[PDB]
Amino acid sequence: GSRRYDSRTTIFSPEGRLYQVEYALESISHAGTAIGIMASDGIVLAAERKVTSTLLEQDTSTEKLYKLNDKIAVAVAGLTADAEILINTARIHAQNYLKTYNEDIPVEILVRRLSDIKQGYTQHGGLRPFGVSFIYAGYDDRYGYQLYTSNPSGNYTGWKAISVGANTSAAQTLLQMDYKDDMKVDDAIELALKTLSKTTDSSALTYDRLEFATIRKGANDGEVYQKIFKPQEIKDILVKTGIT
Template sequence: MTTLARDGTITAPAAAWSVSRSSYDRTLTVFSPEGRLYQVEYAFKAITTSGHTTLAVRGAGVSVCITQKKVPDKLLDPDSITHIFPITSSIGCVMTGRTADARSQVQRAQSEATQFRYKYGYEITPDLLAKRIANINQVYTQRAAMRPLGISMIIVGIDPELGPQVFKLDPAGYYVGFHATAAGQKQQEATNVLEKAYKKGFAFTGRDDVVEYALKTLGQVLATDLKAGEVEVGVAEPHAKIAGKNVFRKLSTDEIDAALQRLGERDD
């Protein structure tokens, strides 16, 4: 019940104010009194509660991304479960968060890359692709008829001039390049490990070193011994036979198993 004060101001009881505050999480385009957009924060929460952890590292002329592979039902075909997707022949991404949102954004990224090549006659670069998708994400925070996608996209690729690249995008439309980054359930723990290693200086001598380091870091963060069928690894690297051409591909289970064996022998 509102009351009228002698000075002409209208006051409302505390209960009514608290209800008004809680209603700010029901709309996307209205800031709370503290300057927060709750629906955007919920999208970030969907990433950290996704149930899996993702890493990406660049160095030694390659960019590598790695993520957990969990098959929730024994009847599912394991080959149909993936979080790593190709966008162009030389650029790929790893998605963390809501799987349906992830597939939708991957299709949009593939479409944007195709349109860029048709319009300009050459492949889009990782930074331009990251900028374009981040701009689209930001639009999703401006309109009430939309909602932010509950995913984090990490783009890996090789720029013809700048070399290996890693870009991370969030639901708010922010993107930035990284030497190494993480996303998902244990993002903070993974980030701490990567920061300590980077301060000492990444000493990669080749692609295998980067892949093995990514596997080692993920195993350390998860505090478990990784198995080849439980992880996915994507690599953006120079083409093995064509000079000046770069490719992105997922490593096979046998290749991952071989990397884990080399890692185990090195630790022993």
């Protein structure tokens, strides 16, 4: 019968590793680097686009940064198409919670569920896992600002600052070296860009090869605002930190 053509996506190696998870992680390591940094007064998301062309429409684009609800966003590393499947799930999950409890969903709860879905694909159903790692940036009135990452295994962990995708080893060392706890948002913005600048595989860092976002309470009083940066705004913040 058909058994002959079955890869068996959900089995252990003799070392006790999930082959497909491992290989998906290998896949993700060639994806454009994404960085999240959490400050006392906000969160930065910054990501590098896969080697853009000059004729690509840059302003009406979305490859790396996505909005889940008004309080939560994600940075993506891996297959975009896979990520959008999971994003719409997460969006629906957020709305079910709001409808049920008349309260915005706590950041972790959304992250846990999305991670649980990924986990399922590694244990049953014989399908390939999603080739995606997320950085979740969000706010709720229990833990305030939070960063999380989840990967194809369905494992998630919380962070002060973290990178996913390409060159995470180099990227993490540089963040570990300059990160401080009292740090403000605008310093994190600088750290984020200065890190990508050093870890990119490109000749130099330019506005057109970047997506950028912040989550601050720097709107008006006890209420949170998400800012997905326009291309001009990224060009400005790049000059403002003298990287160009």
